[PDB]
Amino acid sequence: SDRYQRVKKLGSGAYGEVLLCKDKLTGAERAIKIIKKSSVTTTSNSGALLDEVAVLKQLDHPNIMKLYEFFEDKRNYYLVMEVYRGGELFDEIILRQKFSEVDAAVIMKQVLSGTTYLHKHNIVHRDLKPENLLLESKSRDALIKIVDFGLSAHFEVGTAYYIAPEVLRKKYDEKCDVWSCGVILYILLCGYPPFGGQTDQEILKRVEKGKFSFDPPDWTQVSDEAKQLVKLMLTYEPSKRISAEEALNHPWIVKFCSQVGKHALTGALGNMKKFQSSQKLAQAAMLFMGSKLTTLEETKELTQIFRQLDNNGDGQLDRKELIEGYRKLMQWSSQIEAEVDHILQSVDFRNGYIEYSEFVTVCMDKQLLLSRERLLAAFQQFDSDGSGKITNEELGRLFGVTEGEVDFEEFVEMMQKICDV
Numbered sequence: 494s495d496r497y498q499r500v501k502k503l504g505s506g507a508y509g510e511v512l513l514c515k516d517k518l519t520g521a522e523r524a525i526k527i528i529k530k531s532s533v534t535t536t537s538n539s540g541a542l543l544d545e546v547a548v549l550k551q552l553d554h555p556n557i558m559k560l561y562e563f564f565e566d567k568r569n570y571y572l573v574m575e576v577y578r579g580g581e582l583f584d585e586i587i588l589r590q591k592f593s594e595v596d597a598a599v600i601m602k603q604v605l606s607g608t609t610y611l612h613k614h615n616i617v618h619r620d621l622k623p624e625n626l627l628l629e630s631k632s633r634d635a636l637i638k639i640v641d642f643g644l645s646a647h648f649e650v651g652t653a654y655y656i657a658p659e660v661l662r663k664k665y666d667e668k669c670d671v672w673s674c675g676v677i678l679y680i681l682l683c684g685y686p687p688f689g690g691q692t693d694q695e696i697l698k699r700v701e702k703g704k705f706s707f708d709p710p711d712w713t714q715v716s717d718e719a720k721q722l723v724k725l726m727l728t729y730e731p732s733k734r735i736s737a738e739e740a741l742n743h744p745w746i747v748k749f750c751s752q753v754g755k756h757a758l759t760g761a762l763g764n765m766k767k768f769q770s771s772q773k774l775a776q777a778a779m780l781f782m783g784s785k786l787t788t789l790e791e792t793k794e795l796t797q798i799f800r801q802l803d804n805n806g807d808g809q810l811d812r813k814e815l816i817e818g819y820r821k822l823m824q825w826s827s828q829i830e831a832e833v834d835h836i837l838q839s840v841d842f843r844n845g846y847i848e849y850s851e852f853v854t855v856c857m858d859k860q861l862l863l864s865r866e867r868l869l870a871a872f873q874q875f876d877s878d879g880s881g882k883i884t885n886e887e888l889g890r891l892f893g894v895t896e897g898e899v900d901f902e903e904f905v906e907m908m909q910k911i912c913d914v
C-alpha cells in the first residue's frame with residue numbers, strides 16, 4: 494500500500510528499527526527507520542517536530558547522512574535515508590597494519606566538520622559513537638558519514654564510553670557531541686577508552702567523575718597538540734568545553750591534515766584491534782541470545798496460530814492455510830510471504846498436506862542455524878591467537894557487559910542453555 498518493499502533489517506537506531514528497503518519507483522535501496530508512535534513519548538508538539546524534520550531534510554554535507562523523505566501514518570513515523578555500505582569506521586581501522594597521527598587527524602577532521610555542520614544547523618547528535626560513523630562505500634576514498642543524529646528534543650523512549658557527564662544529568666546542549674568526539678579521538682590515539690570499566694555502571698561512574706589520564710607507555714610519543722586537543726574536548730564544564738568548530742580548527746588538525754614517521758600509532762592500533770573485536774563479540778553474543786529468545790517465543794506463537802487454523806484438529810495444514818498462519822505471525826505484502834513459505838516447504842515437502850509442527854521446527858531451526866553463522870563471524874575476528882577458544886576472563890568481559898577455556902561449540906551451548914535457565 495506504499496512505495497517501498499522491505500528487504501531485510503539493517504539494525505537499530507535511536508527510537509526504532511532500520512530496514513533495508515527497495516524503492517519500487519526507481520529500484521534504489523534506502524535505509525528506512527520506523528519509529529512506532531506507541532514506543533515514544535512526545536516531549537514537544539507536531540509543529541516543533543516537523544520543524545526539525547525540515548532542517549534534517551536540508552542537511553547537505555559530505556560527512557552527514559542524507560534524509561530523503563519523512564512521512565507518517567496512524568501507527569508510525571518513517572525516515573527514508575541513504576544506505577552506506579562501507580561498514581563502521583572502527584571495523585575498517587582494525588584491518589590496517591599501520592596507523593599514524595596523520596590518519597587519526599584525517600578521520601577527525603571529517604567527524605568534526607560534520608559535527609560543526611550539525612551544530613551550525615542547531616542539530617545535536619546526543620549519542621555520538623563509533624558505530625554511528627559509517628563509511629559511505631567500499632571505495633578507497635570513501636567519506637565518513639555521521640548517522641542517527643537528531644530528534645532528541647521531540648521523543649523519549651556498549652555506548653556508555655561516549656556519553657558526556659551532563660547528558661547523564663539530562664541538562665545538556667550541543668557541547669555533549671564535542672565530548673563524544675573527544676572520547677573517539679582519545680581511543681584513536683591510544684586504542685582504549687578514557688573512562689573504562691567492566692560494566693555500564695562502572696563506566697558511567699568514571700564518566701561522571703570526569704578524571705582520565707594519558708598513561709605511559711601509550712601516550713609517551715603522542716604529539717603535544719593531540720593531548721591538548723583531547724583535554725579541551727574532554728573539558729568537564731560544558732560552558733568551558735571548546736566548540737566543534739574550534740576543535741576543527743585546532744592546531745593538531747591543521748598540522749596533521751597538511752600531510753607518519755615521528756608520529757606512528759602502532760601500539761594504539763594493536764589496542765584498537767583488541768578493543769573493537771571484544772566489543773563486536775559482545776554485541777554478536779547479545780544479538781545471538783536475543784535471536785534465541787525471539788525464536789522460542791515465535792515457535793510457541795506459530796504453534797498456537799497453526800493450531801487455531803487446524804479446524805478438524807488433525808495437526809495438518811495445506812499451503813494456503815500455512816500462508817494464512819504465517820501472515821498471522823507477522824501481525825503478532827502477501828507476495829513476499831509466499832516466497833519464504835514455499836522455500837520452507839522445500840525441506841518440509843509433493844503431498845500438499847503437511848504436519849504443521851514439522852513446518853514450525855524446520856522454520857525455526859533455520860533461524861537458529863542462521864544465528865550461529867553470524868556469531869561465528871565475530872568469533873573469527875576475535876580469535877587473534879590461533880586457539881579458536883575463548884578464556885574465562887575474556888568470557889567474563891563478555892557476560893559482565895551483557896547481563897579454564899572454551900571453544901566455539903561449547904560457547905554456543907553456554908549461551909543457548911542460559912536462554913533456558
Ligand SMILES: CCN(CC)CCNC(=O)c1c(C)[nH]c(/C=C2\C(=O)Nc3ccc(Cl)cc32)c1C
Nearest residue numbers: 502503504506511524574575576577578640641
Ligand atoms: C546483524 C548484523 N547487521 C547486519 C544486518 C548489522 C550490521 N549493519 C549493517 O549491515 C548496516 C548497513 C549496511 N547499513 C546500516 C545502517 C544505515 C545505513 O546504511 N544508512 C543509515 C542511515 C541512518 C541510520 Cl540511523 C542507519 C543507517 C547498517 C546498520
Ligand SMILES: [Mg+2]
Nearest residue numbers: 803805807809
Ligand atoms: Mg487440518
